[PDB]
Design an enzyme around this catalytic site. Structure first.
Site, PDB file in Angstrom:
ATOM      1  CB  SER A 110      -0.937  -0.023   1.201  1.00  0.00           C
ATOM      2  OG  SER A 110      -1.878   0.955   1.175  1.00  0.00           O
ATOM      3  CG  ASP A 314      -6.566  -2.971  -4.029  1.00  0.00           C
ATOM      4  OD1 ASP A 314      -7.257  -2.006  -3.738  1.00  0.00           O
ATOM      5  OD2 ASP A 314      -5.410  -3.154  -3.636  1.00  0.00           O
ATOM      6  CG  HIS A 355      -5.591  -2.459  -0.294  1.00  0.00           C
ATOM      7  ND1 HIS A 355      -4.865  -2.037  -1.371  1.00  0.00           N
ATOM      8  CD2 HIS A 355      -5.139  -1.767   0.764  1.00  0.00           C
ATOM      9  CE1 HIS A 355      -3.986  -1.155  -0.976  1.00  0.00           C
ATOM     10  NE2 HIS A 355      -4.143  -0.961   0.314  1.00  0.00           N
TER      11      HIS A 355
END
Ligand SMILES: [Ca+2]
Ligand SMILES: [Zn+2]
Length: 391
Positions: A110, A314, A355
């Site tokens: 991320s 995502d 994610h």
């Protein structure tokens, strides 16, 4: 195996140290302990924990000190510009060997990917503004800002919003972002409406002088953060996560010619029948499914440049943004051809995972997470510290 560089793991706008969340790991989540797995397989691996909501810059500073040891130094120029503390938390140093010519691989998830890039840039080039300010004001200067470090052999990013994420455009992003934080607490079996006397999740906001107080639950703490500089100032993850913020960061954070970069994109959506819009697939984390993906998959903005290519996501980040920085960037991105090239973004493609599934925080039995990281590790270990030019 061509190199013995240790692997260092780095989180995004969510994340915490191995001793936080009662041991629930950001790197592995409900699936296990990624760091342990790598270690057990012969790949030396460590974990960084920095401010989840802080700006990539703050994070980088924190990372540097957490790696080499010492007191976090954010830069006099920086601190005076943003009006926060210059010095932060002191660390023992995870890897002193760096100061002796050692090198590491960073695996970031991320926003961690933005942070990793920033760290390499500072290490190699320092900061001109900081150098000049030190010189005009006669203040000391952190090594981080001089340049000339070669600590990073490679950077691997997973689900990183190199060009930002449109999630931040949500009218209610403020509330929903924190709701996401609560969600992750939930994932670890932690309640947000409870004033745990225990640390649990330290946001490391030492520079801003903010911390959860006794008798104060996360719900209450977040209400306070929402009105604080960590949420209202440009020196924040919130800014750097935006499309404009990311581009601003891309204007100066370049790929070093001495480091290998690998990117992994993620996607958990499908394109609608009568629309270019994207919707969340079955299994996507409950939060993203309901609160984030619908927006990410339907939102456009022509002025900004956000078109149909940005809709695949995502659940938190737009896949288009993941293969590497492009807006405001001079960096190059090459589709992986079977050879990892140095000083460029090696686009390793797109994986069908969300994610949170990619790090194990959300379950996904169809994703062999142990193998993914192991393969990754094997690839990083095969990286040559000297590539000989050939036909
Ligand atoms: Ca899932
Ligand atoms: Zn700062």
């Amino acid at each position: 195996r061509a190199n013995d560089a240790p692997i260092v793991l780095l989180h995004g706008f969510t994340g915490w140290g191995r001793e936080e969340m009662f041991g629930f790991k950001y790197w592995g989540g409900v699936r296990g302990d990624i760091e342990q797995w790598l270690n057990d397989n012969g790949y030396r691996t460590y974990t960084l924990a920095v401010g989840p909501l802080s700006s990539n810059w703050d994070r980088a500073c924190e990372a540097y000190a957490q790696l080499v040891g010492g007191t976090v130094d954010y830069g006099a120029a920086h601190a005076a510009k943003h009006g926060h503390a210059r010095f932060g938390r002191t660390y023992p140093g995870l890897l002193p060997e760096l100061k002796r010519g050692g090198r590491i691989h960073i695996i970031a998830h991320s926003q961690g990917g933005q942070t990793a890039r920033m760290l390499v840039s500072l290490l190699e080039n320092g900061s001109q503004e900081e150098r000049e300010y030190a010189k005009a004001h006669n203040v000391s200067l952190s090594p981080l800002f001089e340049g000339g470090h070669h600590f990073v052999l490679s950077v691997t990013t997973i689900a990183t919003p190199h060009d930002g994420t449109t999630l931040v455009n949500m009218v209610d992003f403020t509330d929903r972002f924190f709701d996401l934080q609560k969600f992750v607490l939930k994932a670890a079996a932690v309640a947000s409406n409870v004033p745990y006397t225990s640390q649990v999740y330290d946001f490391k906001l030492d520079q801003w002088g903010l911390r959860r107080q006794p008798g104060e639950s996360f719900d209450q703490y977040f209400e306070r953060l929402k009105r604080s500089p960590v949420w209202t100032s440009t020196d924040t993850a919130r800014y750097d996560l935006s499309v404009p913020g990311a581009e601003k960061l891309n204007q100066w954070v370049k790929a070093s010619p001495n480091t290998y970069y690998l990117s992994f994109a993620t996607e958990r959506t499908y394109r609608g029948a009568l629309t270019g819009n994207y919707y969340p697939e079955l299994g996507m984390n409950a939060f993203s499914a309901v609160v984030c993906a619908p927006f990410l998959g339907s939102y456009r903005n022509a002025t900004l440049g956000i078109d149909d290519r940005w809709l695949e996501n995502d659940g938190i980040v737009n896949a288009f943004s993941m293969n590497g920085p492009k807006r405001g960037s001079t960096d190059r991105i090459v589709p992986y051809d079977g050879t990892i090239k140095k000083g460029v973004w090696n686009d390793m493609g797109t994986y069908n995972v969300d994610h949170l599934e990619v790090i194990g925080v959300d379950p996904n039995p169809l994703f062999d997470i142990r193998a993914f990281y192991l393969r990754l590790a094997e690839q990083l270990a095969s990286l040559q510290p000297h590539h000989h030019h050939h036909h």
